[PDB]
DNA sequence: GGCCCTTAGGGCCTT
DNA sequence: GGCCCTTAGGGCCTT
């Protein structure tokens, strides 16, 4: 379990759930240094605020197979609208951009996604292995769903549910939006989650594909 | 001139004004396809809402030479804070990421930056030139400052802030934050979308014809 | 620097 | 599908 110096928060918008089999339609990543997590920035209010030095990347993609009913509803993305905008599928350009973006961070990198172990990380591994693409060997993975459940001790643990409990308001409306809320949820329990990550972060190389292309 | 298919709105946070040879401290690009500009989406409020299919790229980087007082004050950025967050200078990682980002867009690409001809574009050209990097050809540049002035000649201030207060009668959220200002510029563009699209087709300067701010 | 407007001026617009 | 809950149990997470 290597100590992560940069935490990259990600969320994936897909054609549906694991049985589709889904493809990434939109990827979003917020890259925050560990420093900004150890001592958070606050307003004069003072409410929690996202770090000033914040590296960000969002890429839209047109998937090979169509969306499902509920998916295209909760994403605002169709296969033709993404194609109307000239967005290709998950290809080599994505990888070169993604890896360049990750290269701009100070490793080791800890990818963070809500329910990442059961969705985001396998989905990404599938799309990356199809192209023979690799992330840095020292990359690790943090899933906030088992982490926040294990730290608490019935109760809900949905992203929207967690945010509604930690922050009395309700989150904003995109992949980039979900990363935002997740980053906020993290900051609210930063020293706890930072500890959980330093101990139980799973190596990215150990993440298995969700489905073999 | 090449009909731009994807418009890339960009803004830079640098270490100062052109007279002190500034360096990029933060880049931000919003990539928007032409078909989104042609159909400006609004909320039920109803205010201008950004396109759904949108590509973002924000990169913070530590400059070699230091900021000025005012520069570091308005950006909210310092050499220490960038080094503290482990951000290197304008390197190949930036170029590979930027070019990867641009190649992800349906060409031709039209760069858009407010007062870009006098600041953003030459500064970007300078930073790219040192690394021997260059943007793909058939890519053009659009400055919204003379454009909006030129369009108003058909029948006051033209700063990014004044234009927003005049077009929306409201106040921008973030000030001198690279991502925030691009967000501001894009909203301004959408308000003049059919007009500015024409100005970009009829007269947008080629990026190859962009002269560098300085040569180090 | 380069372009703007009502005089070798005054000021804009970018950080 | 990988986990906790109490007549091949069922709801929670993610799109
Ligand atoms: Mg998710
Ligand atoms: Mg999502
Ligand atoms: Mg600017
Ligand atoms: Mg700015």
Numbering used by the authors:
A (entry chain A): 4 to 156, 167 to 186, 189 to 228
B (entry chain B): 4 to 158, 168 to 228
What does the paper say about this structure?
The three prime repair exonuclease 2 (TREX2) is an essential 3′-to-5′ exonuclease that functions in cell proliferation, genome integrity and skin homeostasis maintenance. TREX2 belongs to the family of DEDDh exonuclease, which was named after the four invariant acidic residues and one general base residue in the active site, consisting of more than 17 000 members involved in various DNA and RNA metabolism pathways. The exonuclease activity of TREX2 is responsible for removing the 3′-mismatched sequence of duplex DNA and is associated with cell proliferation and DNA repair. In this study, we present four new crystal structures: apo-TREX2, TREX2 in complex with two different dsDNA substrates, and TREX2 in complex with a processed dsDNA product.
The DNA-binding mode of a duplex DNA with 3′-overhang bound by TREX2 is similar to that of Y-shaped DNA. Based on the superposition of the two structures of TREX2–substrate complexes, we observed that the regions of double-stranded and 3′-overhang in the two DNAs are thoroughly overlapped. This binding mode is similar to that of Y-shaped DNA bound by TREX2 in the TREX2-Y-shaped DNA structure as shown in Figure 4C. Our determined crystal structures of mTREX2-Y-shaped DNA complex and mTREX2–duplex DNA complexes, clearly showed the Leu20-Pro21-Asn22 cluster is responsible for stacking with the 5′-end of duplex DNA to control the precise trimming process.
